[PDB]
Amino acid sequence: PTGLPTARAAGCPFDPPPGLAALRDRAPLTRMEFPNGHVGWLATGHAVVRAVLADPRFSHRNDRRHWPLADIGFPPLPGDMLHIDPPDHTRYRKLLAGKFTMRRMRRLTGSAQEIVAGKLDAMERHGGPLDLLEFFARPVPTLMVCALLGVPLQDRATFHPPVRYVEMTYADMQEYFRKLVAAKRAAPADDLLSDLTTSDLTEDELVGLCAVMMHAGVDSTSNMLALGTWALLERPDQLAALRERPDLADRAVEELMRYMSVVHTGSRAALEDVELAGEVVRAGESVAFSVQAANRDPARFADPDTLDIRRGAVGHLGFGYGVHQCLGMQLARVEMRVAFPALFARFPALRLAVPAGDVPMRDDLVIPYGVHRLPVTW
Ligand code: HEM
């Protein structure tokens, strides 16, 4: 019956569409008509979203689910583990999870510090005003994925717009990574891609995984760096707390993840009848889920609509949950824990360079949410 509430409020860039809260607080699982007319369900409560995301009976194949944000489904491509179901998905997870632990990703902390440092240096040389996305929020996570995969230093510039060029397609990236995989097979190094050349993945699977990673590790991270910097610079009291207690970086990253919920909406399809929140979701029905509503659920978080880095903690669903929990979440944490405090240590008076209403927001249906540019000065 209901449609998905998607309209953001004009003075409130960080908060969810107003209609979600009253829906969630009344019926955290409810019937929903999708943009294409499919009648499925909408999960907005934190517990019900977790139950959807943890249950392997829920498919993420694009030829099984209906998309909740557009009125529009093909089988998954090699390497696109987010849209592959068990048991193939389980093969990717068993191979990759142990390579993506915090203990392994913390070994890239120095790389993250130096990537961050280099982009801060180029910002100061240019001077304000400038676009934080072009100078910092997009190149930092791009160079981080390049470091993770061991992309040659002299090739990395092909993967992001020049800081002041052809934007690579998926096919362009597959061609590049086919060559790089062959090179690492012949001459291994201490990096993830070299390590994976000894696995059972086919060339097509490994090349697809790399091309996916260059988007999966970049788009959301970039928009988190932009939105999180904007939110922090409006809260000088929280910046003071982070300056005085730099150990608060870890909590601040979790609280920003919860508050921003940039991967705001998704869906899954039932592979068989599933009891969910007192209802039977029948085989073939899609359940849309709202990460952003779940991350503001008062059933789960005190004062959910207040941003307070001092109480930041794991438990939010900003990296997903369960079957397809974000593989890169520990790397994302390492890079954001470096980046947010470093930006304000170098530019303590960082602030917007335009009226807040002039910041160009992404359209309400785009995922991830974020901004197209973030003009800043200092
Ligand atoms: C702050 C930055 C990031 C956010 C907000 C984010 C968010 C997410 C979310 C919400 C999902 C699950 C989507 C769903 O359930 O439909 C996911 C999956 C995934 N992410 Fe991330 N991610 C980020 C960074 C990264 C990075 C840095 C990498 C790689 C280096 C990465 C790789 C992946 C992969 C491979 C999956 C699929 C995992 C699976 O299917 O088992 N992510 N991410």
Author numbering: 8 to 79, 82 to 173, 188 to 401
Give the exact sentences the study uses for this entry:
The I helix, BC loop, the loop following the K helix, the second β strand of β 1 sheet and C-terminal residues together constructs a large substrate binding cavity by comparison of substrate-free and substrate-bound structures. The conformation of substrate-bound StvP2 structure showed no significant changes relative to the substrate-free StvP2 structure.
